[PDB]
Amino acid sequence: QIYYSDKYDDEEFEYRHVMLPKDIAKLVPKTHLMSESEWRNLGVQQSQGWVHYMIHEPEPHILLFRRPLPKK
Amino acid sequence: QIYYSDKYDDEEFEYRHVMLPKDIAKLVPKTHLMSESEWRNLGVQQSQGWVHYMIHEPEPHILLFRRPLPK
């Protein structure tokens, strides 16, 4: 049910969004960004270095992650 | 766009499946499994080791991948 998209990085970070089933959208905190412990609890499994950095307003069931692009 | 499911695994293999936009699902061959060269050409980006192991006719937009449990 949980789907991870392809990654897409820029000259600094590496992004990737996760698509949570809308049935679970209510379990996603609305006023604060999640911490690894939190998003890991919704069932999101991924590299520890992924950081929830922003809320996708239009579609809050779509979590927005990103991680530091090595070397610079 | 292309989406990758979560992973599960039996005793020997670690399974996962890719969901392709109906647009590219047109290009998914119906007569044979795809080689790494083939799926990568579609856009499916994954580490080597993951192999298109089974054809799923009822849903041409869902590619079933597999990998041997890491050594």
Domains and CATH numbers, chain B: 1-71 (3.30.170.10)
Give long-range contacts, CB 8 A cutoff, 24+ apart: B23-28: B25/B60, B25/B61, B28/B60, B28/B61, B28/B63
For B18-45, letters b (16+ CB in 10 Å) and e give bbbeeeeeeebeeeeebeeeebeebebe
**DSSP state letter for A43:** T
Experiment used for this model:
X-ray
Within 8 A by CB and 6+ apart from A21, the residues are A1, A2, A61
Q: Resolution of this entry in Å?
A: 2.9
B:24-63 residues touching chain A, CB 8 A cutoff: 43, 45
Residues of A with Cβ-Cβ distance to B2 under 8 angstroms: 5-6
Give Cβ neighbours of residue B27 (< 8 Å, ≥ 6 apart).
B42
Nearest-CA neighbor of B18 among B31, B54, B10? B54
Do A3 and B1 lie within an 8 Å CB cutoff?
no
Least CA distance to B44: which residue of chain A? A6
A36 three-class SS = helix
Distance from the Cα of B3 to chain A's closest Cα (Å) equals 5
